[PDB]
C-alpha cells in the first residue's frame, strides 16, 4: 500500500536550496522539491520534472541518496520517498504562487520550520551518506517511532 514520491535537495558545498510551500502537503514548511511520480515515468525523470516545476531549475546530474517511507497513522497510503541530491544545476530559482525558494547556509538549516524527520536524516545527507529510513507520524508534528540506517546502495 505505498505511493511513489521524489524529493530533490540542491546541495552545494556551502549552501542548500529549500522551498517554502504556500498550500497543500507541507504548507508553511521549508522542503526540498518533489512530488508524485507519473504513470510510465521513471523515478529519476519524476525527480527532474518536479525540481523544474517547483523551483524553475534544470538539473543535469542527479544522485540517489536515500529512500524514506512515511506512515501517517490512520492514513492507508504509505509515502515511499526516493531522495536525490545535486550540485550541478542551471537557471535561477523561481518564486511562484506555490513555492518561495531560498538558499540556506549549512549551519543555518531551518529545522524548526521543516518536517520533523529532516533533523534525523539531513545530518547524513550533509556528510554525503546514503540512507534507508521509515518514520511513523501521528498528525504532521509528532514522530511516534522511526528507523534510520546508513546504506551503501539506495
Ligand atoms: C513526513 C515527510 C514527508 C515528506 O514528503 C516529501 C514528498 C515529496 O513531496 N517529506 C518530509 N521531509 N517529511
DSSP 28-68: TSEE-EEEEPPTT--HHHHHHHHHHHHH-PEES--EEEEEE
**How was this model experimentally determined?**
X-ray
Cα–Cα distance measured from residue 152 to residue 66, given in angstroms and rounded to the nearest whole number:
10
Q: Which atom of ligand 1 is found nearest the CA of 31? A: 12
**Which residue has a Cα nearest atom 2 of ligand 1?**
115
Cell readout for 44 is 529519476
Residue closest by Cα to atom 11 of ligand 1: 115
Question: Does 50 carry a binding-site annotation?
Answer: yes
H-run or E-run covering 1: none
Identify the structural domains of the chain with CATH numbers, from first to last.
1-154 (3.90.79.10)
Is residue 33 within 8 A of residue 45, CB to CB? The reply is no
Residue 31: closest CA among 100, 130, 134, 127: 100
116 is in an annotated binding site: yes
Q: What resolution does the deposited structure have, in angstroms?
A: 1.7
Amino acid at each position: 500500500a505505498s505511493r511513489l514520491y521524489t524529493l530533490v535537495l540542491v546541495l552545494q558545498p556551502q549552501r542548500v536550496l529549500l522551498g517554502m510551500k504556500k498550500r497543500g502537503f507541507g504548507a508553511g514548511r521549508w522542503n526540498g522539491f518533489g512530488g508524485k511520480v507519473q504513470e510510465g515515468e521513471t523515478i529519476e525523470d519524476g525527480a527532474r520534472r518536479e525540481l523544474q516545476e517547483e523551483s524553475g531549475l534544470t538539473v543535469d546530474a542527479l544522485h540517489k541518496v536515500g529512500q524514506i517511507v512515511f506512515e501517517f497513522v490512520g492514513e492507508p497510503e504509505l509515502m515511499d520517498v526516493h531522495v536525490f541530491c545535486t550540485d550541478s544545476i542551471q537557471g535561477t530559482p523561481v518564486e511562484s504562487d506555490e513555492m518561495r525558494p531560498c538558499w540556506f547556509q549549512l549551519d543555518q538549516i531551518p529545522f524548526k520550520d521543516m518536517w520533523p524527520d529532516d533533523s534525523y536524516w539531513f545530518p547524513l545527507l550533509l556528510q554525503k551518506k546514503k540512507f534507508h529510513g521509515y518514520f511513523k507520524f501521528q498528525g504532521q508534528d509528532t514522530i511516534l517511532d522511526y528507523t534510520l540506517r546508513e546504506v551503501d546502495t539506495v
